[PDB]
Amino acid sequence: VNGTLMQYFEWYTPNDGQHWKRLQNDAEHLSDIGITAVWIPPAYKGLSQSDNGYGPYDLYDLGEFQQKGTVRTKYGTKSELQDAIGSLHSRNVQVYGDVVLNHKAGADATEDVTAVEVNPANRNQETSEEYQIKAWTDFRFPGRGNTYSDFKWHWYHFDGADWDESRKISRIFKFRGEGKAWDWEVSSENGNYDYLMYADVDYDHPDVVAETKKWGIWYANELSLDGFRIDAAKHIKFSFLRDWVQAVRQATGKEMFTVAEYWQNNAGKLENYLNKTSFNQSVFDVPLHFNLQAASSQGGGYDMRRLLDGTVVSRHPEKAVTFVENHDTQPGQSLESTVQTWFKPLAYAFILTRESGYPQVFYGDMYGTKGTSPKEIPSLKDNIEPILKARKEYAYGPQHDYIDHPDVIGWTREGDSSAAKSGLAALITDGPGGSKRMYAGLKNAGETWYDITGNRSDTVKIGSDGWGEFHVNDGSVSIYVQK
Ligand SMILES: [Ca+2]
Ligand SMILES: [Ca+2]
Ligand SMILES: [Ca+2]
Ligand SMILES: [Ca+2]
Ligand code: NA
């Protein structure tokens, strides 16, 4: 059956500590609609209870220890997470854990460090004389102690930080020391994009490298994870991420599917990342997200024939996790690039009913986002579920593309022996609707198909030659399947 991923959280998921319970309770629903894997938010202790997990303090504290004024993380306790994972597994749904290895936040104390300021637009360029600062680099894990790992962090395990406690100033501080330099083989943006935020981990440090692989194996085992989602990959030494994934797979003997969040709308750079990680992990199809967002926001002027241009799914579908939206692109966020509501179901049809790519459904799109703007994403589960049904039960067999009009594009799937009634004919348009004749397969001759989305109430009779004339409304989507 087709695989479908679901990012199970949004930026405004509440800090009520009930998210793991929500996931456990949603297990049956997710399995029924076709979700086969869930990407959960960072499960370890952040700098505070309210942190979304991208400001990780202790990777070995899965909401288990008394650290940062809380036992549970924003999402819940370790046991509640394990219960959720157990429920998902009982329903044949896999779980991918978020991996945040770029930096550490919320150090226990500062340490005297000799550093130098670097140009934010070119981190290879020092901009000040070297001086002593008080950097938050001492991570001792007072609540966990040596449970699971006795590794303690110090300034020399980091390449830099952005805050000096002595002068109370923010700058991009690069640490001085034997062998200290920004990690190489990271995005070349800003000269060297190794530094992003908080205390930057030094992946040139052998102990850090070894300890992080040990943690990865521990993490996978502790939660019975089936895979990973790697955070801020373009800011982490590529060869390290390559080796880290390899180490976990070698130790667990499991596939451990991994998708990296390499955030750059550039197929060439994404290709480079794949090469530098020996194609051992997928990447989110950032270009496709931007193409979909462009189509949704250009008032019908976007040339739909170019929707696959420069996308990862077009070149390496085997390494592409296609998506419409995520917590960083949703309204008000750091990478804001929201696919407009009217086009959203069309975008989902594009990633869910086509043969290429591993598609991902966004929690915020299914259940809405709880931000405070006047443009929050509404709950679109009623529009998305019929499309998920199309993917689960009908998106099989030979595909025929008709991405041949600047507004109205479509494709068909003939269906195959995996499901006797599989097959579909999809049409989407970023402007006026209309009809398009498409070959749906001679094997479907004489059948009557209907629009599973319910947007149109008319049926289509497949001709004796396997062709049908399919219709779609203005700025809409229609997916015809056998009655
Ligand atoms: Ca380094
Ligand atoms: Ca880094
Ligand atoms: Ca158009
Ligand atoms: Ca059929
Ligand atoms: Na680094």
UniProtKB/Swiss-Prot annotation:
Ca(2+) 2 binds at residues 159, 181, 183, 202, 204. Binds 3 Ca(2+) ions per subunit. Binds 1 sodium ion per subunit. Pfam families: Alpha-amy_C_pro, Alpha-amylase. It catalyses: Endohydrolysis of (1->4)-alpha-D-glucosidic linkages in polysaccharides containing three or more (1->4)-alpha-linked D-glucose units. Disulfide bonds: none annotated. GO terms for biological process: carbohydrate metabolic process. The record marks 328 as: Transition state stabilizer. InterPro entries: A-amylase_thermo, Alpha-amylase_C_pro, Glyco_hydro_13_cat_dom, Glyco_hydro_b, Glycoside_hydrolase_SF. Belongs to the glycosyl hydrolase 13 family. This is Alpha-amylase. It comes from Bacillus amyloliquefaciens. The lineage of its organism: Bacteria, Bacillati, Bacillota, Bacilli, Bacillales.
